[PDB]
Structure formats: structure tokens, C-alpha cells
Symmetry: D2
Subunit: 481 residues, 4 copies
């Protein structure tokens, strides 16, 4: 398999040391395309996690004390190494998580861009001087690393989730203990390996593998951890925020979404269809910003449905390492069951399957890209994140009406719409209750803009100048002359 075999790691990284769990237990990792065992990863608990936090704390003063340029040098080394080893990293990711190799290569590039961006940002952590309240007073604001930080990351973007958190943390001058998804830990550990090679000192970046709560409970209850960042389900987000209350930790969360994708009568339809295909079926729909509800205005509903159906039959389901495959398997059978459930629920409420609608002939974790039409506003899918390759099409008549429908949810991460009228664009863009709004495009991803949710969708922002804020503390100094 790999050009560089040392990128494949079956041990956790704590304080510069590759280690097994104290008790020797491991978690098996399997290939979602076929069920084959790829390897394993330590099943760590509180004790190893505690040791990792103590290592992060011990390494903090010396990391914090480096110049921004010397941190930038190390981080840029990390970035360069990621790009150098791109092919191996992509292969590793396809094997453990399932997405097509081209998608995985794209993710490596995107993931790496966070390391580069924040290396640069670290040199631009600006304080302020503020005109004084009295002639004999001087006011200075500085921004300093929050300290030891914890990160919990999901399985759907096994590389980019890491770098979206480690990038700003390390560039801020913080240290980090990261717990990657048990289903896709290899990508995280490979990045850890490249961090060593880049010159990241022992204890500055630690990767601890184990079962959800064992590691997580220690991360949220240890007062040395001053900041937690989590990406995943809304329910676990709730529990983690509750747990963080004891120490009044600063918490960043990127949670559930239920993205509306809105096509107005004045849209460029071919572009809407391309946007919809890219937005819905990226990572087989296993994305927090995937179109989950497709609202199409009555004037263009029939034409759009036809074009979308034409475009969808062109997708190739298969093993993500094979030529021309554009839809891989879902992560597990639990993901499949949810897609199945959403389809059944839409049917019981009067929707019609136009195409797909069932598990793929391959079985296992493979599901057919599917289109539902005549989907009513009371359907589960209208309220609940699908996380799979299902396009449900909601009809609409009126702009005010669709805005009300789009916003009628506790979530508020990404939304998309297609329209050409300037005034319409402003009205809809402004009225949508979402943290991210794609306008005439289905692909919004980059490292330079703030990515995050409002409402039940989360707290804080990732990427951009705003992204590093969450890892800093403001200090106000008032000097008496």
C-alpha cells in the first residue's frame, strides 16, 4: 500500500512517545467498502488521557515562549510534509473512511491549508492600544494562548477536522490533546507522525484513541484543560457543554445541520443542478453542510427534477480506490438504517421515490443515491439530518414562504440558494438563519472564511482571522502614570 510505511501508525502519541494502552486493549479498524480489518489503535482511558493532559501542560511554557515566526516555521514544515505525502494520506483515508480517492486527495489539500493559514495568522495576533479614560492612564490589550486545549473529532473528514483545530491552537501558542474518531483514527495518527517530523516538540500535540466517554470524561473534567473543541452530533455537543460547565471552559462546537438548498425560478438551472449534485453527494452526503432539503420554486420544479435525475444516474458507486467511483460506502450500517428510515417516513407521508430508494446490490454499507419528490414539510427529513445520499425535493411557491420553511428548524449551519436578482439575493441572504450561506454555488469550503453554526448548530468559528480568536484570551492592561 504506502510509499512511506511509517505513516501507518497503530499506537497513540503521548508526549512524543508512541504507546499502547496501559491494559493493552485495542480497537479494531475496518474498511467500510468490504469489512476487512485494516489494523488497530489503542483503547485508552482516563489514565492515558490524564498523562496526555499533564504532558500538554508541561510543554506549554516552552511552546508559548517561542516567537510566532519559529512556530510558523514548524507549522509550515507540517503543511509541506502533508502535501509531500498527499498520495499516501489520501489512500489511508479512503481505506478507513470510504470516500473516493479524489475526494480524499481534495481533503488532504484542504486540511493542510488550515495548517498553512494559521502558521501565517500566528504572526498577526494583534493587540490594541485604546485612548485612555484619564490623561494619566494608558490602555493596552494583548491576546495570549488560552493554554491546554482538547479536541474531539468525527470520522467524516478524518484529516480536515484535525487541522481545523490543531492549526489555530498551536498557532495561538496553545498545546493540544486530541481524540480522533475510533472509526477513522489512522488519518489523525499519520498527521501526528508528520508533526514529529516537522519539529513539533514532545507534548505540544498529543493524539489519544479510545471509546467516546472514557477519554472524553477526562478531557471535560480535568481543570488543566481550559478549552474544548468538538465536531459531531448535537446530542454529544449538549453533553460535552454540560460537562465543561464545572470549570467554565471555553467551548467550540460544530454540530448538526439540516441545510436547505433553494432554487428560485430565476436561477440558472444547469448551475443549480451541478451545485446540488456537488453539495448533496459529496462524501456520500456524510457532511455537516450537505444539502438536506431541496426547495425548488413551482415554475422550475419539473425541469429541475428531470435535470437532477439525469445528472444523478452518472454517479458511480463502488470501492473508493477504483477508477471513476464517485460514491463510496457509508460509514456503518447505522448510517444506512437512518437513510432507510427517512425514506420510509417520507413515503408514509405521501412522498414518491423517483429513483434509488434502497440499499445497493453490493450490500454492506452501500446505499443507492435516491430522489424523493412531493416531500411534505412534516417529514422527518425536513427536521432531521439525513447524512446520506438522499435528495428530497420540496416544492414551493413563494419567497417569504420558503424563507420561513428554511428557518423553521433548531439548526443553523449551512444553507444554499440560486437566484440572479440582486434584491432577492440580499433579502434571502440576510433573512436566512444560518452561519454559512452559499449563493449560486454548492461548494463553499476554504480556510480563509469563518465556518460555523448559529442556534443549535454550534458555537465559535473555524478558519479565517476569526478562527484563532477561540484559542486566545484577551488581557486588558491599565497603566497608571
Amino acid at each position: 500500500k504506502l510509499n512511506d510505511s511509517n505513516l501507518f501508525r497503530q499506537q497513540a502519541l503521548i508526549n512524543g512517545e508512541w504507546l499502547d494502552a496501559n491494559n493493552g486493549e485495542a480497537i479494531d479498524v475496518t474498511n467500510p467498502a468490504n469489512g476487512d480489518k485494516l489494523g488497530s489503535v489503542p483503547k485508552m482511558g482516563a489514565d492515558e488521557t490524564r498523562a496526555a493532559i499533564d504532558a500538554a501542560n508541561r510543554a506549554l511554557p516552552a511552546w508559548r515562549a517561542l516567537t510566532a515566526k519559529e512556530r510558523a516555521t514548524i507549522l509550515r514544515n507540517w503543511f509541506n510534509l502533508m502535501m509531500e505525502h498527499q498520495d499516501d494520506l489520501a489512500r489511508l483515508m479512503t481505506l478507513e473512511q470510504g470516500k473516493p480517492l479524489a475526494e480524499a486527495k481534495g481533503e488532504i489539500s484542504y486540511a493542510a491549508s488550515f495548517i498553512e493559514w494559521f502558521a501565517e495568522e500566528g504572526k498577526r495576533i494583534y493587540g490594541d492600544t485604546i485612548p485612555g479614560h484619564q490623561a494619566d492612564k494608558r490602555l493596552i490589550v494583548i491576546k495570549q494562548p488560552i493554554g491546554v486545549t482538547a479536541a474531539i473529532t468525527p470520522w467524516n473528514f478524518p484529516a480536515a477536522m484535525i487541522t481545523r483545530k490543531a492549526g489555530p491552537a498551536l498557532a495561538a501558542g496553545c498545546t493540544m490533546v486530541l481524540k480522533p474518531a475510533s472509526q477513522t483514527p489512522f488519518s489523525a495518527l499519520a498527521l501526528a507522525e508528520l508533526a514529529i517530523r516537522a519539529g513539533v516538540p514532545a507534548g505540544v500535540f498529543n493524539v489519544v484513541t479510545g471509546s467516546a466517554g472514557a477519554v472524553g470524561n477526562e478531557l471535560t473534567s480535568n481543570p488543566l484543560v481550559r478549552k474544548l473543541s468538538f465536531t459531531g452530533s448535537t446530542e454529544i455537543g449538549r453533553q460535552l457543554m454540560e460537562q465543561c460547565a464545572k470549570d467554565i471552559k471555553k467551548v467550540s462546537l460544530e454540530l448538526g445541520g439540516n441545510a436547505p438548498f433553494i432554487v428560485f425560478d430565476d436561477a440558472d438551472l444547469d448551475k443549480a443542478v451541478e451545485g446540488a449534485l456537488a453539495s448533496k453527494f459529496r462524501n456520500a452526503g456524510q457532511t455537516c453542510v450537505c444539502a438536506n432539503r431541496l426547495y425548488v420554486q413551482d415554475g422550475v420544479y419539473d425541469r429541475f427534477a428531470e435535470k437532477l435525475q439525469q445528472a444523478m444516474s452518472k454517479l458511480h458507486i463502488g470501492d473508493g480506490l477504483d477508477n471513476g467511483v464517485t460514491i463510496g460506502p457509508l460509514i456503518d450500517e447505522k448510517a444506512v438504517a437512518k437513510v432507510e428510515e427517512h425514506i420510509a417516513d417520507a413515503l408514509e407521508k405521501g412522498a414518491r421515490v423517483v429513483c434509488g430508494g434502497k440499499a445497493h446490490e453490493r450490500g454492506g454499507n452501500f446505499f443507492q443515491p435516491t430522489i424523493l419528490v412531493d416531500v411534505p414539510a412534516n417529514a422527518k427529513v425536513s427536521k432531521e439530518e439525513t447524512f446520506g445520499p438522499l435528495a428530497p425535493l420540496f416544492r414551493f411557491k413563494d419567497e417569504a414562504d420558503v424563507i420561513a420553511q428554511a428557518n423553521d428548524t433548531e439548526f443553523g449551519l449551512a444553507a444554499y440558494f440560486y437566484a440572479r436578482d440582486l434584491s432577492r439575493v440580499f433579502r434571502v441572504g440576510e433573512a436566512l438563519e444560518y452561519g454559512i450561506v452559499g449563493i449560486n454555488t454548492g461548494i463553499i469550503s476554504n480556510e480563509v472564511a469563518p465556518f460555523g453554526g448559529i442556534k443549535a448548530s454550534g458555537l465559535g468559528r473555524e478558519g479565517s482571522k476569526y478562527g484563532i480568536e477561540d484559542y486566545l484570551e484577551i488581557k486588558y492592561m491599565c497603566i497608571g502614570l
Copy 2:
């Protein structure tokens, strides 16, 4: 009492209406100097709070839709009214909370400044344009009001605590339901009255008085509330943050502090003493940023102690309405009990009373300005928040030792130090784990600088350009050409 009798309110403000509780129950409010009943306020519960939230929700679109200048006009009217009625407002505050009239006048001025500052800041909510990731993409960031907000405020700064939250909320384009302290609600309600007179529309700013549980539980559990701001004890902060997890609310907290006040060998000792007197004994020590631990270097310990004792003998205890009174009573008998406990604890651990030491001859809520020496680091008085006119005094050797001692706490709000050497000032200023650092000054309060805590001391900042951020949501728009 008052020049304008209509400033004294004994009813809550909901949706522009002055109301009693539905069940007509009231909370009595007494004068802490003597125990006299001043009046009462409604004892509202979930029902009235719910109705207030619904009013704030209803009022939000039209408030949000005003220009920043028209919001500024209304807020500047409120500011001007506060300053016009300064004398009445100060009197009202002295009567209900106890502080000397001059301190109350000072607080009105400071409280009002937040309204003015944020009126101005509202016009300066700047979005961004960011260079695109592709030639056919445009990136725009806008900042919009988070929506309906809740505020819970304490008794120690009965006017400033209101304006530090209502100012940025309203200027951001949010609406607000505020629950003021049951011991000092009149200040809040007078401000409410002036908000009506200023042109603040019905439902934009609501003040609900009642039991903490009954009002607070509704604030934290109603999903229409998207943001909570609280100032008070660390334990209630923990509970409120837990409760906010359900809706993933944005939370601002300003909590406990245990402020170290550090005097180095090279300090101006007369200035250090002045700063210590101002910092420790302001509001009789009932301040979240009050000096709570006095660290004085070996070389100057004896001289500082002598000078401090000279300066303190000049302190005058009495009714806050009387000439020359500089120490008023504490807020209630439990305030006294805590101070008494901290003394008892330090003595049992081998400390010495240098002056004060017990409850004043007047009795009731009055307490003797107290200094302790020979206090060990594990004493209640040096680990917990005292909120009384009691200071332990510590000797230290050098820079390294005192920094370690200063930072050896779960808190992180304010710290102070006195030194003249430039290098020392940077070293100590940077090393202190506090959100606020006073350097050669004991008074750091203003509206223009970010005020808040790190660690267990809070989340978010109040005042300054950063203050309004906590009430805004960032929206990223990506336009496809």
C-alpha cells in the same frame, strides 16, 4: 425622597406595561444601613417571564430593522436621561444597596457610559470582504444580532451591571429580558423607566423581578432565548451554563475572583497604598475585582503595612447618605457571616488580626475593615472570593515566587501590581493568568476596554469593541459568479 418621583417603581416592565405578578405576590426590599422597608417589587415566575420572552421575540424584527443611527438616537436619549437624573438614581441606589452616595454617583456615570459607548459602537459593526478561493467566487462576512437575549444581574453594581449588558444587546439589534437582583431591583426599574422615556419600543427591553429559580429556569430553558449573560457567583454560573446546554445558547459569564495585589521592592509605596485602599475598600470590598490578597515584597513589607494602617484609620463607616462616609454596610447578614467565617478560618490556621477583625459597633450589616497577616496559602480567605472588607497580607521574596502564588487559583479575573522597572512590568504583566491587570493603579474601570475573566472566572468580555461581539452572529456568504 426624589426630585422625580416617577423613577421609583414597584412594578415590573413587560412589553411596555408596568405590571404586578399574576398572583400579586411581592418581594420586600429593605435598606441595609438600618433594616427599614423601602418598598417591594413583583414576585414573578415562569408565566410572566414567558410572556416577557414572547414580547422580546415579537419586538425583535422591528428593532433589528431600524438603522444603526436611529437605534443610536434612542440609546443616546437613554444615556442623556441617566445623566440628567443622576442625583435621584444615586440616592435610590445608596438606599437599596448601601454604598456611599459619591460611589453611587460614580456608578451612575460609569453605567451610563456603556449606553453611550454602545450607541456609538452600533454604527461600527463591520463585516468583511475576503479575497476569494477561486476567481469566480466572492466572500462576504456580515454580523447580525443573535436575537432574543436574557440577562441576570447581581446586587453589587445595581446600575452598571444592567447597562453593561443592555447596552451592547440593544446596539447589536437584539432584544432583552433582564432579571435584576431581588435585593437591589429599584435601580434596574428606574433605568427601565428612563428607557421608556428615551423611546425604547415596547418589548425591546423588559425587566422581570422574581425568584431566581422561577425566572432563571424559564430564561435558560426557553429556546427563543439565544443568548444568556450572567454576573454573579461561580456556582450559579456553572448551573446556568449547564442549563444553557440544551439549546446550545451563547453564554457570557462574569464570575468569582480572588484578585492578587502585588507590591514590589521598587514600587512607589505611597501610590501602592492609595491603590490598595481604592481597590480593596471600594463598595466595602463587594466587588468582583477587589484586591483579595495583598502580596508585598520582603524589602518593603513593614513600611507598606505601616502606611496602609495609617491610611485605613481614616476610613469612615456609616449610612451611605451621610457626609464623609466612605464605608457603607454589607448587603445582608450572610455577607457578614462569610467575612466572619474567613476570619475564623485564618485565625484557626494561625493568622493575626492587625486591625479590624469583627462586626462594627452599629451591628446589623456593618463590618470593620480588616487586615490579616500570617495567613497560609490554603486558607479560605486566600482561596475563595471574600466579597467583604477583609485583606490577608503576604510577604514574598522575588518575582518567580509571587507569580506562582498569584496564579495558584481556579480564578482569573483581575490582578494588580506595582513596580517601576520596565522589564519587570512586561514579565509580570505577561505571566499573570488574569483577564484584567492593573499596573501601578488600583482603578481599572472604564467602558472602552474589554472586561472579563479567564479560567473559572468567566466567558466573554464587557465594554470595548469586543463587548458587542458576544451579542452578534457571524454570517459567511459565498457568492458564485
Copy 3:
């Protein structure tokens, strides 16, 4: 006359004293509507200007040394006084410059807004801290007043031109010597009077009246003057910039414009006509941002021309003090002469007058609002600033053609266009070589956005956070630990 007779001043203000010229010579000021003498102002020269500069220099340390808040108090007093005396100030302006009373009241309000805006901005002059290049280095940037400043202002906006320069100068902590237009000096002197009443100290703001080059030569050659701001003709801009080279003065310039006004096929035509009317005929076309060239796409040319002609009928010419008058006289005979020359030049090159086109029946400085068609691109009116009620109409074919035509000029001040298509709006908005671009609106004026030109049109910006920059010097401080 006036409600407050002391607003009418016939003396200059130097160092808090109302003075005549040393030689007692005066400049007569006449009413452009009828030629009546209104009064006179001192005809000052180098001597009095030098004394004004010395007074500004002398007052600088104490003005600079005030807190931002105390400068804000004084400037807000000035703002408030301007609004209080709005009616008198508007009357005074209509009498001396000619514009309709409603336009003059509008200008007072707009002029005043600069004083308020900058009073606020003075409190928000932010320095920086920058991460250091070495561990033992600290980098701090502060912004300080440039020092003594000079302002030269034109006759077309006799109040707003003052406040757009004095506002940011005084808020920055600078002092100022201002030379107003000889044709409209009363508005400037009234403002000066209000500055006294507001608490602006002697020598902080001085108004010297006199003949262009005598006062100007002293302003540009005196090394105590560190900054010059000028609004007027391009040719005088060139000369003043040349003169400022000796001392390497910081120079702000707002110069000539030749504003294209572009109407696309997909425009809302009624809104385009309304915008065109407002943009072209405001201040009788005597505005640096007035539509000077009207480009209308082939598909809508005929309809637009018809509608514009209908709308122009409801403009009423007369004395600006009379009810319903919407076009006053031009400033003088020379202005009438330039409009006649533009029309004559157009006609001899094949142009055709649609309506108007001759001096008004009243004579003097009154001119008929005029539409010209068949105007060649080599016509004086398509190349030069007209500053009169003259609307030439240009046909166009496609977007790329009109952009090339709009940009084919040395000027680059304001441009306007009307379109509904989102992509078109971006393409055109981005490609126009102008400092200010109105999109689907003819009225772009406010204090909060940066106003200024590119190319031969000027240097620097007025209004906004960028406006105060031109009156500050950046100071970089590098501290060695």
C-alpha cells in the same frame, strides 16, 4: 433675518478673537439670486494667516493632552449647537450660496453628522501590539495627531466641506487653520461661532478669510503646517500639491469629477429616472459627484429619455427662499458662462437640445435645466466637469463598451449604475475606476463610508474610520527586554 443674530459674522476668527484684516480691506459677499450685498468678510493675507498658524501651534499641546472623552464632549456640544441652530444656518447658506432652503437644511444635518461621527471616532483610535521578531522584543504601534493642519474649502457645500475636515482633525487631536471660499464665508464663520460656544479652546480652530493665493501660499509654505486638506478644482489641487512638496506635507485632495450614470436594459426605469434627477440636479448640478454623463442602453434609451423629460418638468427654478423651488441660481456669471460654452460646443459638434438650453428668463445666475442628445465623445461636456444643470444622454450597446467609455477619463470620483442582475452588478461595480459607486441609487452621501477619488480625482478619504487616518501619524515602537 436670523433667530440668533450673533451667528452672522463679518470678521475672521484667529486665536479666539474676532478680527478685521490688518489693513482693513474686506471682500463683499452677494446673494446669487439677485445680486444684493449681504455683507463682507476680512481680506486677509500672509500676516494674519501666519498669526493663525502660530496660534494653532501654540494651542496644540493642550488640545492634544485632553482625553478623547473631553474632546468628544466639546465636539458633541458643537454638533448639538449645529442642530439647535439648523434653521438659521440653512437660511444663511441659501442667502450666500443659492441652493433651496430644504437642500440647505439637509446640508446642515449632513455637515453636523461629521462632527458627531468623529467625536465618537476619536475614542477609537486604536494602536496595535504585533508579535515580535525576537523573544526579547516587543512591538507596539500608536497613532498620534499629525499636528497643525490647514484646510481650504469650496463654495458648493459651505458647511459640509468645513466639518468633513475640522471634524477628523480636531478628533485626532490636531489643530486647524481653515480658509473658506470667498463667495460663501458666512457659513464657515457661523460654524466658528458655534465652536466658541461649544468650548473649542482659542487657537484650536481658526477661520481666515482672504483671497485664494495670499492665504494659501502661507498655508503651503509654513513648515508648522504638517497637513493640508483641499476640496476644489483639479488645477488648484495640482498647484497646492506642488507647493506642499517643500515640507513633504501630508496632502488630502478631493478634486474634479466627471461622473458616469449608467442605465442597463434590466434596470428599474422609474427608479433610474428618480436617481438621475436627484444626482444630476442636486445643488443645480454644482456637485463633485453629480451625474455628468448619462449612459442608457439601446433597449431602454427612448423610454428613459421620455421619462426623464417628464420628471424634469416638475423642477421649479427660483429664489431658494421661496416655496417649492427646487433649482436655485448658479454661484455666479462665470458658472453660467461655462454651461453656455458646454452647450455651444456640443451643438457645433452635432448635438441636439431636447429641452431647456438657454439662460433662464430671470437672467443673472439662473439657467434652464437642460437635456442634450447626439453628444459626441469629443464634446467638452463628455470630458470636462460641467457644474451646471446639464444632462447629456449617451446611447450604448453592451456592458464592456460602456465600462470602457466610463473609465476613459483622467477622473475617478463617483459613478452610478442601475441593474438588477447580480453577476452584472459585481462585474460593473468591480470594473468601474471610481472611488465611489452608487448602485441602483443616486444618493450615496453619509458620514460613515469613505468618500474620495482615485486617479486625478484626489487623495485620501473623508468620513468613516478611514477619514481620521489622514490626520494621524503612525508611530512604531520597538522595546528591548
Copy 4:
């Protein structure tokens, strides 16, 4: 000689082509250490410069149209190449300009950092959105490249002067025509060569060699050039600013300095001496920020003078290619003469040579580091830029006195002072009329902070987030809904 022989170029670079002058005339370049001919560069004039401007103009749309990241990729390649070829570039520079090899290597590294920094800054050109003046208005500010730019650079920092201007220009999206110093053109042309290798397209960066005004007259009179940046003498700065007035060009200037270096009673003397040695004798005192006047307080004057004299023994004069040489030759005989003239005027006015005092035994351009004492304020050296290894020592009594003396000059570039007292540091730091202030350090150079002068010392800033502003135009767009 060089590792990479193609770095040594004897032709100009215009539109991607290496060219001789139209008339084949060349300028000889000699080694200042011995007078040897190194080679020559074209003696170009108006015609070639005009062709270069046309080439820059032609290349602008496609350079402007790239994404910020693709410009960053090209610029980072340039940076990397500079660091890769550091040894050759350093050698080339030492040969043509004379400075020690270690100084030259340091300049290459410093010069390269501007290219890196601005590559990063280009991705961070932020526009704004501003809250509207009316509910139906939206305000957007964008920042766009100013267009074709011209740069004129001096001989003292033959690499860093180029990159300080080309860096921000190209990162802004501008194109550039650069005229390097005729005495040190090879460094510029080598950088040009690496720009080709980096992927900088033809016409984006042009280097035209020629003698002063020939090239300069065309740069300043050609209206396609919209921005000029110049570093050199004050007198040429004045002339260039005058010439730029015709087109109202945006002008950046870094001119003469006369840096005061102030040592207070409470300074660390050994550190002051080290700082003074580094500040005064870097590049043999041929730097715009070199200490030119040494003010030492009465209490420490004698001790400082003794220590400075001891330290001046650590200076080793010779060929910059030889081991341990720390002072090279001056640039030419005219430089030697000016130093001899300053010493003579100082002695004529009563000053005394403590050490050195005349040309170095080698002759040619070699001069002895000199200390003067007993220097009066009327000496030329107190008013004029020496640009040579001459340290004059002034005695001062107190703070107010030295501040007044320091500021008593038309210059305002760099100043330095040594003091430990916090209050003193603020007082003096704030009161100094300089763009750059070193505090307890003699070395202030970096790419992250704004570098530039006030008063007659310049316009604009180089390095930092501010550095790019001078190369952008602000565009205000106002959208009507």
C-alpha cells in the same frame, strides 16, 4: 565567482526580456573596496522606461485577475529562491556596495522576509460592510490594486529596498517598474532573475537601469503610473513629489533622517553601548535610521564615553569579503568627503576627536570610525545626515531639555533611547517626534511593523499590514434596495 552564474546580470529586464539600451550605452559598476570594474548595466532613458510602463500596464489585468493564493504561490517561490541563493546574493552585494558579507547575508534574509510577509498579506486584504444610513441601503467597501506602480531605490540596502516595494505592490495585485541605484544595480537584477524563475509573468516586475532623472522623469510624467515609491535623499524626494503633482499620483517616500540616540542616568550602560555600536556603525553608518546624534545624560556621560571607546576597538576595517571585517568602505569619495566635512565643521566649532578622526590608511572609500565629544548644537552634524561612521556625543541635563533637542529638526524618521523607568519610557516614547522609536534596543528592523517617517522624513509606511495600503485604492459601494 558565484555558485549560480546566471544570477549575475548585465542587462535590464523589460517585459520578460533581457535587454541592452536602445543606443547600447552602459553604466560601469565598480567595487568600492578597491575600484575594480565588476561589470556594467544598460544606461536606459525615457524610451525604454516608456516601453517598461506599457509592459506593466499590459500585464496588469491578468496579474490582477489571479487569486490571492496563486499570487502567494508565485511570491513564496520568489522568497524560497532568495533564501536558496542567499550566499551568492550576499557575495554579489558585498562586491558592489561594500558591506561585510555577514551584513549582506543578514540583508538578504531581511529582504526576503518582505516577499514572504506580503505573499501572506495579499490573502488578507479585507474590505468592510458598514451599517447603512437608510434601511434600504447597503454599504460595502472593497480594496483594489492602484494599478501600475514605479519604484526608485537607493544603494545602501540594494536588496531590501527592492523587496519592501515590490512585495506589497505585487501582493496588492499591482505591476511594477523599478529603477535601482546605478551604483548597486546587480542586486536588483539578480532579484529580477529569481522573479522569472519563481513564475512572475512577463511585464509584472520590470527593472530598468539608467542614470537618475532620465528614467525618473518618465516614471513621474507618465499618467499610466498611478503610484510612486522612493527611498533616498530629502531633496530628490521633494522634486519627485513635485513631479507627481501633475497626475495627482499616490506617493510613498522614505527620506533623510537625523536619529537622536538618548542615554538616561538610569539606563543599562553596557546595553546602551552595545545598542549604540549596532545602531551607528551598521553599514558603516550608511543607513537612514543610524544613530546620528548621541545624547548622554550628565550623570553617565563620562562612563558611557569610556565604554563606547572601548567597544569601538571591536570594529575591524577592510574588504567586506575578508574574515572578521565589520566596517567596509563607504560608497564613494563623496561619502568620505561629507564625513571629513562634518568632522571639520565640528572642530571649527570647538569639538574634540577622541578616536579615529580621518581617513583610513587604505585610502579610497575607507574611513576610521570616529568619536567626537564637546559638540555644540549649531554644528552641521546636529542638523544634517552624516551617512558615515561618526559618533558625536552631546551632553544633556534633563528630560525636557533632551526631548526639545531631539525634536528640534525637520526630520522625523528613527529615534532611540535607553531608560528603565516605566513612566519615563512612556513620557519620552510619546513625546519623540519620530516614526520609529527604539527603546532599550539599537536594532528595530523587521517586516511585521510599520517603518516610515514623519515631517520631512517621508510619507507612508513599509512592512506590516499598513505597508500594503499604500498600493491599494479604497472603493465605496452604496447599493439601493
